Design a binder for this molecule. Structure first.
Ligand SMILES: Nc1ncc2c(n1)N=C(c1ccccc1)c1ccccc1C2
Length: 133
């Protein structure tokens, strides 16, 4: 019943500072431009201990399935090959991606009727707000 409040289909409604976040991650110009235009959905489901997060957009369709606390391989939408671990901390899903001696953290939290996604790469934070589809 862990992540019940996350389950569902969500649509992007606002973004702030995402180009700067992508620059800090190392995303190149053309991918920043096209991927920054995208308006993904996020489809979150749970089956037993396995959480699945799918993100569909005109740019790319991605999907991850995982167990909390258990590292996995992920290919990001910008084609990074990262080692990811996702945990639940005080009701927030905390997703750490490691690659090339670098690290970024993505937090997903329910706030009112929204699902708020905060992405942090060193000093740079981007906030993306999703609402139910
Ligand atoms: N489908 C789809 N399309 C576009 C994007 C995207 N997913 N996902 C994100 C993203 C964002 C925050 C946390 C996790 C993922 C992503 C990652 C890097 C570069 C571009 C995008 C945009």
């Amino acid at each position: 019943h862990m992540c019940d409040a996350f389950v569902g289909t969500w649509k992007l409604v606002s973004s702030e500072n995402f180009d700067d976040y992508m620059k800090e991650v190392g995303v190149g110009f053309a991918t920043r431009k096209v991927a920054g235009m995208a308006k993904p959905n996020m489809i979150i489901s749970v089956n037993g201990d396995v959480i699945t997060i799918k993100s569909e957009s005109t740019f790319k369709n991605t999907e991850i399935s995982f167990i909390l606390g258990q590292e996995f391989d992920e290919v990001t939408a910008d084609d990074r090959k990262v080692k990811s671990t996702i945990t639940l901390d005080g009701g927030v899903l905390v997703h750490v991606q490691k690659w090339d001696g670098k690290s970024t953290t993505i937090k997903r939290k329910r706030e009112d009727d929204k699902l708020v996604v905060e992405c942090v790469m060193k000093g740079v934070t981007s906030t993306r707000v999703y609402e139910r589809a």
